[PDB]
Amino acid sequence: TISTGPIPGSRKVYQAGELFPELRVPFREVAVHPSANEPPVTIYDPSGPYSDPAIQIDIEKGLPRTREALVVARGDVEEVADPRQAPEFPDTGRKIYRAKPGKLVTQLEYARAGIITAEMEYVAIRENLRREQDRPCVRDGEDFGASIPDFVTPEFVRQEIARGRAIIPANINHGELEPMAIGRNFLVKINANIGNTVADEVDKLVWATRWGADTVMDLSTGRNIHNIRDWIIRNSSVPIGTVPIYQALEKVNGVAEDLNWEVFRDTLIEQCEQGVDYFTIHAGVRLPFIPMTAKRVTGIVSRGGSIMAKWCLAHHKENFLYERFDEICEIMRAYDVSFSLGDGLRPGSTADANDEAQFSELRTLGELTKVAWKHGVQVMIEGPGHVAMHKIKANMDEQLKHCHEAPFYTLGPLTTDIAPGYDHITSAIGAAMIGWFGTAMLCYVTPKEHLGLPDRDDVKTGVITYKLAAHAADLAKGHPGAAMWDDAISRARFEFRWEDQFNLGLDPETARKFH
Amino acid sequence: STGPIPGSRKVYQAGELFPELRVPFREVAVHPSANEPPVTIYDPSGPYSDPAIQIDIEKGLPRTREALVVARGDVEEVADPRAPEFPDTGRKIYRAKPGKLVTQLEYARAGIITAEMEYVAIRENLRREQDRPCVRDGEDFGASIPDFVTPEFVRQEIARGRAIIPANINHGELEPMAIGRNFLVKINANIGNTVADEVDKLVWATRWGADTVMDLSTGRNIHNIRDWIIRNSSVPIGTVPIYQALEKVNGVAEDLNWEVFRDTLIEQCEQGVDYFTIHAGVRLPFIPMTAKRVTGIVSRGGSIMAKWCLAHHKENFLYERFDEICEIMRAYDVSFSLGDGLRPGSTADANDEAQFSELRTLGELTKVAWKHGVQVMIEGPGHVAMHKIKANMDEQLKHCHEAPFYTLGPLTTDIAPGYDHITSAIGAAMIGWFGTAMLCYVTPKEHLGLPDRDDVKTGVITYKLAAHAADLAKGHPGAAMWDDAISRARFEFRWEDQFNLGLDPETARKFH
Numbered sequence A: 001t002i003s004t005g006p007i008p009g010s011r012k013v014y015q016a017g018e019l020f021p022e023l024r025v026p027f028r029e030v031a032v033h034p035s036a037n038e039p040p041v042t043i044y045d046p047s048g049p050y051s052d053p054a055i056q057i058d059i060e061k062g063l064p065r066t067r068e069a070l071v072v073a074r075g076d077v078e079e080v081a082d083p084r085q086a087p088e089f090p091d092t093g094r095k096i097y098r099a100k101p102g103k104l105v106t107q108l109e110y111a112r113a114g115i116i117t118a119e120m121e122y123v124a125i126r127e128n129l130r131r132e133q134d135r136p137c138v139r140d141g142e143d144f145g146a147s148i149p150d151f152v153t154p155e156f157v158r159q160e161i162a163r164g165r166a167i168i169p170a171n172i173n174h175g176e177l178e179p180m181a182i183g184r185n186f187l188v189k190i191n192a193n194i195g196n197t198v199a200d201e202v203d204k205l206v207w208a209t210r211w212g213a214d215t216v217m218d219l220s221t222g223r224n225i226h227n228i229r230d231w232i233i234r235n236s237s238v239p240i241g242t243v244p245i246y247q248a249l250e251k252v253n254g255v256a257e258d259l260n261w262e263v264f265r266d267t268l269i270e271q272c273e274q275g276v277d278y279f280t281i282h283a284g285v286r287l288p289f290i291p292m293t294a295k296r297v298t299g300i301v302s303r304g305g306s307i308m309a310k311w312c313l314a315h316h317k318e319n320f321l322y323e324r325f326d327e328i329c330e331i332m333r334a335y336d337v338s339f340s341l342g343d344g345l346r347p348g349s350t351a352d353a354n355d356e357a358q359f360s361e362l363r364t365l366g367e368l369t370k371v372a373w374k375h376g377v378q379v380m381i382e383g384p385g386h387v388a389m390h391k392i393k394a395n396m397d398e399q400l401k402h403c404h405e406a407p408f409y410t411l412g413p414l415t416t417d418i419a420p421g422y423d424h425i426t427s428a429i430g431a432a433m434i435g436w437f438g439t440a441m442l443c444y445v446t447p448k449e450h451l452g453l454p455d456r457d458d459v460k461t462g463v464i465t466y467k468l469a470a471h472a473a474d475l476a477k478g479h480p481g482a483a484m485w486d487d488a489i490s491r492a493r494f495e496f497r498w499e500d501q502f503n504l505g506l507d508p509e510t511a512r513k514f515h
Numbered sequence B: 001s002t003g004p005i006p007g008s009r010k011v012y013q014a015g016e017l018f019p020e021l022r023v024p025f026r027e028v029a030v031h032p033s034a035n036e037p038p039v040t041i042y043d044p045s046g047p048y049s050d051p052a053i054q055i056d057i058e059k060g061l062p063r064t065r066e067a068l069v070v071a072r073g074d075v076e077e078v079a080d081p082r083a084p085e086f087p088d089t090g091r092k093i094y095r096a097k098p099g100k101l102v103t104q105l106e107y108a109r110a111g112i113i114t115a116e117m118e119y120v121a122i123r124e125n126l127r128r129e130q131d132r133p134c135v136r137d138g139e140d141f142g143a144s145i146p147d148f149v150t151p152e153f154v155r156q157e158i159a160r161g162r163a164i165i166p167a168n169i170n171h172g173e174l175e176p177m178a179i180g181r182n183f184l185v186k187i188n189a190n191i192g193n194t195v196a197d198e199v200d201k202l203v204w205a206t207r208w209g210a211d212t213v214m215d216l217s218t219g220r221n222i223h224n225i226r227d228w229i230i231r232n233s234s235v236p237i238g239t240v241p242i243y244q245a246l247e248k249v250n251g252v253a254e255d256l257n258w259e260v261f262r263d264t265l266i267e268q269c270e271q272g273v274d275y276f277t278i279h280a281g282v283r284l285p286f287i288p289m290t291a292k293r294v295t296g297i298v299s300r301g302g303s304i305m306a307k308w309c310l311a312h313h314k315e316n317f318l319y320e321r322f323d324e325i326c327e328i329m330r331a332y333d334v335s336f337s338l339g340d341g342l343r344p345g346s347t348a349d350a351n352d353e354a355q356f357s358e359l360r361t362l363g364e365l366t367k368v369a370w371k372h373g374v375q376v377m378i379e380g381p382g383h384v385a386m387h388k389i390k391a392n393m394d395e396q397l398k399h400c401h402e403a404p405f406y407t408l409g410p411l412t413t414d415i416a417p418g419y420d421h422i423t424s425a426i427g428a429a430m431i432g433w434f435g436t437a438m439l440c441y442v443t444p445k446e447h448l449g450l451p452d453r454d455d456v457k458t459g460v461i462t463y464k465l466a467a468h469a470a471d472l473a474k475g476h477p478g479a480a481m482w483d484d485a486i487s488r489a490r491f492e493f494r495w496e497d498q499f500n501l502g503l504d505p506e507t508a509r510k511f512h
């Protein structure tokens, strides 16, 4: 029913930075009955200000730009002389920034110059869940050669970003952002999709993030998509991502043939100034790969992959995203937008998993990653897809090898195709396992996958399903914070403290009702 | 609850060794343009989904199996055997003739192939043509899955105790099924707390995929009600006799003893229960080992036995009288489900000393059960984080001599009440992959309340698909067919076929 206010059974708490004393990193805290002699349980919370009583929400003003000052203080950016140009959002009060000529701006660039930034301390704090460094947490799990710290320091965050084994998606023009980290050596994150009135649109974002969504993709097609994204980004505290191909496609009235470098370049710049934190770019869908998808059962199922194939076969030119890749990096690094190197060749049936085509694009994404790093741009890689359990590890091992350990961002894997209406379940099996194997992010799947558009309850089921999938994985990896919550909830079950059981759960209201 | 299952029709295949067997299947036909044969699906729903058969729950189902049992001539009528009462006049009650063989195990060992065995071999083949072999893609971790199942292969597996066909001779209504690592992963649904409504709960669970069903009823009339359930079930029925023995002494665990227990076994054995859950592995020495746990003892049967052990300070009388229990069971062909009263109820407690000490004990007991010629399977976790799941499998194959494994879940995390079907589907898929023969299902309302009809459906669908993902990954011969058929439909925009090839076509079609 409600989208705003405290999350039942919990209250919003902050921890302050030390390197950067003005940082206030968010958490939510669940207190248990006094008889238990237990401290309150600390839980990772991406809901942002919408679940903070102290802050009043005005979507026409947007969230407080708590991060603007920290970026400007680095003095690596300047106001943009004249920027590019459904109700219009009143964007009068916000300056639009771009890096100064020849200057460093991206999290990757700083980390490699040995600098630690506000975003990096923010994240190290966020990932520690207010645990006490002094107490030796004893480790139980299997991380398959991971490097998870007993406790996370900002310096370790700099190292990980330096070797490209983690990213902090943070467009300088997204001042509303509460920074988070994506990477194998951190807590597994999840992303939720949005898109097809304004209050209704922002609300779908508030909703996804209320239940655990770490980031959100605007997958909107059609008209007004730029103007509507204004209200979404101005009011989001999670990183926003897009597929700029969709917007470029509308600038040419929906005809793939008519795409070209110009409308694409312009769309990049609009979104960069608007605040998009990361772009999905199917730069790996190459001419010679398309023929490889003919012997498949389901063919090409990526909407971005389809668009590129349509363009390549009509012009018989090579994918212009792969050709102009360098000039794409030069734009993104001027804003600190991150790459989501997309997999237009992902398998849409378990029969097609791990075939030549998907693996050819994977190797090409690997090469592309290396190029992106030279320009100092942050990178993650997209993966499957539909994959039967027994092929899931293989997919992980290929990715760590040919993609140089960049963060992996999969959708599922769907572990079987026979349950339309239940794909959030088929995919939670694959997602849990692949997060265990080393995946950094999981794009969620709602029950209405392959069937229709998700209503607010489907979205919630999707989110909760993936939050628990991500957590199951954290437990298995032996992540130091995981077992606390598990043990906390299980003690309450044993002492019949029903109230604490509900509140310790991912979905108290539902737990309490069913009782 | 009855009639054909949307988008399919009931089909039958006939036995060769046993010409009068009719083994069930459902068939899904696709658009003519597709030039595909109809897809054959495993169907435990029974006669309730066959229009040609009239249902009268007061008469029960046709005892299509009585004749085959009697034809073996290894049984005799019982002189004098032991909520509305079920009119049981038309049904003779059987017991083994003195000194004779009756259990599937005994027969298999004697080199004999029985009706049940050919029934199963057929059922497990899904009407595939032995002609055209399928090409293997998967990973079965040292399993021995045939490209095609023959009755002889089923006799072999039963002989070595690596598979079981739960089939009490007094359950003539049964459509026999196989449980075993080397076959399709089966799933189990629970029932229990009017008659029409109780039988309905079992028709519903079986309609959606449940291969067997456990009556977990406690309280009064539990025996009389079970009459309605067994007489109308085409799937094996199981119980925990301890629950019924506990009501004979008004709910006081101290007051249990060998007598009321013995009497409960015999009642149910004559009634037709196909297998018993017996917590014979909850020994005096183990109980103290569960004190340093986070959740302690979470089995209802385990709790009962612990309560009895600590008040009398004698050893678990189920473990003491184990031999006299096998002697009763083998006289009807009841199968064992050696229970794990020491299962973990929190991830923290998984794979600890207590659960493993009971597991080794069930391994010993398994051996003894076989000498008495009684079929055995072992129960497992429980709550287990993914990283500990393979370990649990490797332990059981070693110390349990490869007997069929029967897990509940495992729940891979404790933090999601209201969604435990999801947390347990992750563990269930994996463990089935690793070698588990049967998965007891979990509904959304686990740890919270009692399952309504919708919950029970979600639970069953969730486990059917978990079991399938596992078959796919094990590289099972029949699994990929159905996956590829449903995907071709998706690729050709044959939306109607995509719905019908699904585990829940009505839901799929509504959502679209």
Ligand SMILES: Cc1ncc(CO)c(N)n1
Residues within 6 Å of the ligand: A219, A243, A280, A301, A302, A303, A304, A305, A342
């Ligand atoms: C159906 C579909 N295809 C592709 C993508 C990404 O390009 C997506 N998010 N959804």
Ligand SMILES: [Zn+2]
Residues within 6 Å of the ligand: A301, A347, A348, A349, A386
């Ligand atoms: Zn798909």
Ligand SMILES: [Zn+2]
Residues within 6 Å of the ligand: B298, B345, B383, B447
């Ligand atoms: Zn439990």
